Symmetry: D2
Subunit: 199 residues, 4 copies
């Protein structure tokens, strides 16, 4: 059993003019391909260390596992979080939760934009579900540290703010990218992930 690079669920150019085809093609076919590959290498190294009881080797592998494993986790969610069919606002129970927990949809967007723009260096902004509290929650995570693994929050919507996610098109102006990405958020998918959290 090995991890595999999921195909992108749309054409490389499908999110233009919000995120261009050169970015989507590099982001998926180079960056994500490399996370999956490095993750499988690291998992096998870890299995050997575990079989040997080599704790030094397990701990030495931790940064590569978190970075590439987190990369695999985060980008697998990210591709489904975007869509040419996206944009606009969610409906039904996700919308009501957003209004209840953040005041309004636009207040929510301000909070997730602020968490995303606020990342210094590489990282991600997330809308998550706090299972213990039974409500929504915003967090930012450094580098590829994944949401559920490092906070327990269930990921609903992630925004990649590594410079490779935007730089070719938006250069240093990360806020321009955040403004554009709202046009391609796949609220159908974020709703699916939210409803899976509730029972």
């Amino acid at each position: 059993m090995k991890h595999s690079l999921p195909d992108l669920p749309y054409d490389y150019g499908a999110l233009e003019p919000h995120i261009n085809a050169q970015i989507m093609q590099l982001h998926h076919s180079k960056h994500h391909a490399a996370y999956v590959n490095n993750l499988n290498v690291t998992e096998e190294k870890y299995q050997e260390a575990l079989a040997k009881g080599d704790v030094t080797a397990q701990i030495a592998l931790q940064p590569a596992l978190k970075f590439n494993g987190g990369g695999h986790i985060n980008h697998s969610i990210f591709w489904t979080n975007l869509s040419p069919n996206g944009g606009g606002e969610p409906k039904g129970e996700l919308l009501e939760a957003i209004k209840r927990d953040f005041g309004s949809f636009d207040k929510f967007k301000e909070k997730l934009t602020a968490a995303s723009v606020g990342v210094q260096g590489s990282g991600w902004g997330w809308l998550g579900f706090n299972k213990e509290r039974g409500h929504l929650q915003i967090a930012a995570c450094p580098n590829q540290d994944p949401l559920q693994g490092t906070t327990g929050l269930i990921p609903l919507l992630g925004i990649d703010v590594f410079e490779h996610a935007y730089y070719l098109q938006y250069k240093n102006v990360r806020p321009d990218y955040l403004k554009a990405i709202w046009n391609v958020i796949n609220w159908e998918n974020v709703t699916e992930r939210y409803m899976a959290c509730k029972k």
Copy 2:
């Protein structure tokens, strides 16, 4: 007394084809300009917090101070570490120290390349001087964490591996950028910084 953006000591296109003019112009006129400005804002906020004894506010300012202050420190060194007159190998006492501490110049390049490529997320690779030990030392630093402030090592040569340092030209292939940058290292400047360490 305020910090100021140092002019680049050469034309934006001067390091082509190793680092292109679009990168140098954004890197200096957008990214470094923003570090200096945010650093001065943060220093003034810190002075007010200090005058008030507001320790919460001092600690809340720490990430912006380290990121933008480190950014100012690191990029101020970086521009002088590059030159259209660069490339090749150092001479005299710096060369002898490199051979003594790392075996050879090429062994040194391998070690600094490995530290630079090994940064996961944003960061820097450094050749530094360990004043206590009286010899050279390689370290990598995360995000804009500056060498001397976080390790005590005196900076001689830094390699920026934030994606903005290379992505427009080299895309995901960070090793291609590291290979190119050796052609523009200003060994005259690294020698000046080294000789200043010795007395």
Copy 3:
């Protein structure tokens, strides 16, 4: 501007048998005294560094400033959070908020206990108020990182889980210390801090 060691609101033995007198005496007159003395020294070095535009020195001083500054913040709150007259349950709107946000007083105790017992190495567990969400929130902080300065949450109740907070009495058994400290929680103070957070 000159921070001072606050007088304790009771004598060192007032929280016995739950926290013994020797711990309280060492905790206040040695550990907290050192946070204050070290904070003042570090603040003076920061004034000198700001005056000189020495950003390296500012950043080098950060770990000591957060550790001792955070120590001053945290322990100043901690003393007021405990009382010989404490224990039992809170009343009124705080009790209502606890039932609403954590399900019950007992479940809140389990959650703050688990966050405090869960710190690996030195740190703190906090009950805090989230100003933006208008509700209570539990978080853990590493070392002396203070809650408001690093998370924006307003501190209501803190539990020190540095080993010096419990070791002389409870040795390695941090869960016995957590069980005992509920007997001396100054809910009157936590209620004051909570009511201050609302208009």
Copy 4:
């Protein structure tokens, strides 16, 4: 694969008066026992997670694996680094290396003392061997982060500066513990570890 708590090379009181019997007994039979028990439990969860390709669980387990795994690594070395027959100075090639790399035995002691006293929060000071540079090197590590797993340096001599390593005897005065522990350094073991690092 089943890690075990190593028997101590001496009885719990053998390092008195420098480290008293109660500390040694708690340190080995409670703290180290817990690192081993927690490491084994965490390793079993990692085997389950690897078998399922559950990367979230792998990453969630990392803090416990490094803390308890690192605890196992560090404390297993620590016990062998101390002896009732210890103290004094090393001989031969280790003494030569110490004089060469740190100037003198006394200056080496000051440097390892300063690194150990300098840890804010929990951690370790290490004398290590740098395989690539072919010389000795001092470093500090936070919490239980182990030296070789996080730095590649080979451990020669470790000093535990978690508060449980000294508090019952020395209370807050970590410098008195550092002065006392030189009396029980097992230089025969440190010499064996050093000679193993060379061909």
